[PDB]
Structures are given as structure tokens and as C-alpha cells.
């Protein structure tokens, strides 16, 4: 046999952890992304890029550690270790935020590798590729949020920093500056995620409560055999129940499970489209008719205008520390504030 | 003119009609506010 | 309220064009042998 065929044999051996040709891309990249996150969160600072402490070594906890984005002055530089910024100096690279681009790039290629793994394994075992197809939603979210959005903004600095509290700050920044909650694409994403959770719960519970009695045990799990040919629960009884409770019910199992694929995947894709818009500040920020009315009529008020006031507060109070490169100095007298607070 | 053998009938069952109408009407309800602005 | 004038026709067509597409397909399915 040729060396290519021998290598294919070895890569596709049946072992505890499947490797595959996709493994050559997936495993080094996924390992480097995860290891970079752990290394940065344990030992690396954000002092020179954000003015922040961001590691266990500095005293942060699991909620506050992060691998923070590079400084805004770096633009969209790849920040390669051998690049002109760090110039091969590992310590300076870490201090300049090279770990953020390191993680983002090795992670993107790791996602590519994992999807290729889905395809490869499906082909080898003879199943259809719908798991790989569904994984396109996480990939679309990751690309839109961590690459396209910063690429449309001034620099990597405004991408999410890899951390719990940093992600929370990302949420609040999007509310304050983009009015992201008002965006119908985020709304469709929310519908997809919450509806997916609803479907997950309702289907699990319906199956578990329409099981057939296939054993004498009061714990019903042992009464299923993976090689059995018969359905383990009564579709007829479940359909009757939901028809009489909610008015409509599934009657086709194949449609049911495809719908479970369709809902969350579509929702995430819609959210990604919205974020592509926000990359250009192309927001659903205002309703022009309401703004005209409110400008002319000081007694007109809605929850929309109230939320706009909240956004103005967020921007004014968070910008000076969240965007240190701007050198904002907002005198106390200019800060928006309500009475007494 | 010999007929084309690649023709196939097309279908949309009643449940699909209801699901599609629901999708369309809900999308309209969602986006109408932004169309009116 | 000073709304976008074209919003009315935009919404009407957004609803009607896909809905009529679906109705055509459904009725012609029902009429099949």
C-alpha cells in the first residue's frame, strides 16, 4: 500500500479518542486555544492594554479573570509572536495582548477542525451529516461576534474579552451603545434559544411520562434495550394529551426532531446577522416617530424613552474607564443624573 | 413535442400551510414596527 | 405619529406575497387525485 493509504489507516483506527485527518487540525488548535485561555487567566495581566488586573496571580477570581483584548492602538494587527509589534519577545507579546489573537485564531481553526470531525465521523459510520450542519450556528455566532464585529469597529479592543465578567461587560456595552435589545435579529435569536430550551424540556418530559411499562422496576430506566425495535413511549398517548391540553400536538416523530434542530439553529443564525449589522454601528437604536413626538411634546413618555435615558447613563458613566485610549475627562457637572442619585 | 420526463408534482400539506402562515404573520408582526419607524 | 409612509405597503406585501404563495401550493395539493 502507498504511504497515504497507510496513514489513512492509522488515522482512522478505532481507538478511545478518534483522531482522523480532521484531528491534525483540530487537536493542536483546540489544545492551544484552551491552554492559552488557562495560561492567560492564571498568569497574564491586562495592565498595559486596558489598565485592568485579569489573572489569578494578580488576585482575580474565576468570575473576574480574563484574556483581554489588545490595546486599541494595535488596530486589527494579527499580533504574531514574530510580528513587528512583539518582535519575538514572548513577555512583551503577552503584555501587548498577543494571547487574545492567539486564542481567537487557534480557536477559529479548532472550530473548523471540529466541524470537519463531524463530517468525517458521519461519513465513516454511515449516518447523515445533520450534526455537522447544526454546528454551523455556533460557528456563525463565533465568527460574527469575535471576528466580524471587531473588524468593523476600530480594533480588536472592542471584541469580547475571554472571561466571565468581561462577557458581562460586553452585554452591557451592547445595551448602552447599540440598544441591542431593541434589535429584531437579537429578538429572533432570543426566541430561538428560549424556544429550544422549551422544546428540550417538553420533549424530554413527554417521553418520560408516556413510557410503556417494559419491566417490573419502579425505576424505569432498566426497561430499555438499545437494540430493541419497538418504540419505548406511546406517540399516540402523547399526541392525545397535547391535543387536549394545548390544542395542537406533534403527530410525526421525524418532523418533531427536525423542528428541534431547526429552532435553535435558526435563532442563532439570526442573532449573528444582527451582530454583523452592529459591526458597522447599523443599529436598531431609535423609533423616529416616537423621537419626533417626544421632542415636541414633553408629556409623552414610553418605556422606549425610559430605556434611552438608561442608555445615556450607561454611556456617560462607563466610557472614561472602558475606553482609556480616548482620554475622556467628563467633569462631574456634565454627567447625566436624576434627582438625588 | 415529447414531454419532459424530469417533471415532478409539488405538495404542501395543511399543517405546512398553517406553520408557514404562522411564520409569516409573526414575522410581519415583529418587523412592522420597524417598517413604520 | 409621523411614521414612514411606505411602512403600510411594505407590511401588506410582506404578509400577502408569501401567504398567497403558500395558499396556492396548498389548494393545488388538495385538488390532486
Amino acid at each position: 500500500r502507498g504511504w497515504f493509504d497507510i496513514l489513512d489507516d492509522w488515522l482512522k483506527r478505532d481507538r478511545f479518542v478518534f483522531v482522523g485527518w480532521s484531528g491534525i487540525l483540530l487537536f493542536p488548535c483546540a489544545y492551544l486555544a484552551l491552554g492559552g485561555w488557562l495560561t492567560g487567566t492564571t498568569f497574564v495581566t491586562s495592565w498595559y492594554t486596558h489598565g485592568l488586573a485579569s489573572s489569578y496571580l494578580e488576585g482575580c477570581n474565576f468570575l473576574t479573570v480574563a484574556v483581554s483584548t489588545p490595546a486599541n492602538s494595535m488596530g486589527h494587527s494579527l499580533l504574531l509572536l514574530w510580528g513587528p509589534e512583539a518582535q519575538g519577545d514572548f513577555t512583551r507579546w503577552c503584555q501587548l495582548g498577543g494571547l487574545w489573537t492567539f486564542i481567537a485564531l487557534h480557536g477559529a481553526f479548532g472550530l473548523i477542525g471540529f466541524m470537519l470531525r463531524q463530517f468525517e465521523i458521519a461519513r465513516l459510520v454511515g449516518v447523515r451529516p445533520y450534526n455537522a450542519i447544526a454546528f454551523s450556528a455556533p460557528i456563525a455566532v463565533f465568527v460574527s461576534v469575535f471576528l466580524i464585529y471587531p473588524l468593523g469597529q476600530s480594533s480588536w479592543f472592542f471584541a469580547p474579552s475571554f472571561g466571565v465578567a468581561a462577557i458581562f461587560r460586553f452585554l452591557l456595552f451592547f445595551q448602552g451603545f447599540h440598544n441591542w435589545t431593541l434589535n429584531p435579529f437579537h429578538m429572533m435569536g432570543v426566541a430561538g434559544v428560549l424556544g429550544g430550551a422549551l422544546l428540550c424540556a417538553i420533549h424530554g418530559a413527554t417521553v418520560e411520562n408516556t413510557l410503556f411499562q417494559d419491566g417490573e422496576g419502579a425505576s424505569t430506566f432498566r426497561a430499555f434495550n438499545p437494540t430493541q425495535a419497538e418504540e419505548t413511549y406511546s406517540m399516540v398517548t402523547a399526541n392525545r394529551f397535547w391535543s387536549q391540553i394545548f390544542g395542537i400536538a406533534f403527530s410525526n416523530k421525524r418532523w418533531l426532531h427536525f423542528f428541534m434542530l431547526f429552532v435553535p439553529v435558526t435563532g442563532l443564525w439570526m442573532s449573528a446577522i444582527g451582530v454583523v449589522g452592529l459591526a458597522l454601528n447599523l443599529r436598531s437604536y431609535d423609533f423616529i416617530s416616537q423621537e419626533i413626538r417626544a421632542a415636541e411634546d414633553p408629556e409623552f413618555e414610553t418605556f422606549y424613552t425610559k430605556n434611552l435615558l438608561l442608555n445615556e447613563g450607561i454611556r456617560a458613566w462607563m466610557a472614561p474607564q472602558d475606553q482609556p485610549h480616548e482620554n475622556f475627562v467628563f467633569p462631574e457637572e456634565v454627567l447625566p443624573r436624576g434627582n438625588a442619585l | 413535442m415529447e414531454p419532459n420526463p424530469n417533471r415532478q408534482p409539488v405538495e404542501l400539506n395543511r399543517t405546512s400551510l398553517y406553520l408557514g402562515l404562522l411564520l409569516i404573520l409573526v414575522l410581519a408582526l415583529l418587523f412592522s414596527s420597524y417598517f413604520f419607524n | 405619529m409621523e411614521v414612514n409612509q411606505l411602512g403600510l405597503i411594505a407590511t401588506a406585501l410582506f404578509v400577502l406575497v408569501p401567504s398567497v404563495f403558500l395558499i396556492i401550493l396548498y389548494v393545488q395539493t388538495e385538488s390532486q387525485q
Binding site: 399516540v236 399526541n239 391535543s243 390544542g247 395542537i248 400536538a249 403527530s251 | 400539506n13 395543511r14 399543517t15 398553517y18 402562515l21 404562522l22 404573520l25 409573526v26 410581519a28 408582526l29 412592522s32 414596527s33 413604520f36 | 405619529m1 411614521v3 411602512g7 403600510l8 407590511t11 401588506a12 404578509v15
Partner: peptide, 30 residues
């Protein structure tokens, strides 16, 4: 016009509920 549009769409959705529940294609066991 905008209020009429919103309410019209809502009423259509409710009618759709009615037909989808009471004029569904009946499930039939094989």
C-alpha cells in the same frame, strides 16, 4: 393606519389559531 395594521395582523393570527386547532388534519393511526 399603523394601529389598524398591528391589530389586523393580531386578529389574523388568532383566526389562524382557531383553524389550526379545530380544523386541523386529524391524526389517524395506521
Amino acid at each position: 393606519m399603523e394601529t389598524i395594521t398591528y391589530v389586523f395582523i393580531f386578529a389574523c393570527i388568532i383566526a389562524l389559531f382557531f383553524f389550526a386547532i379545530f380544523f386541523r388534519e386529524p391524526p389517524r393511526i395506521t
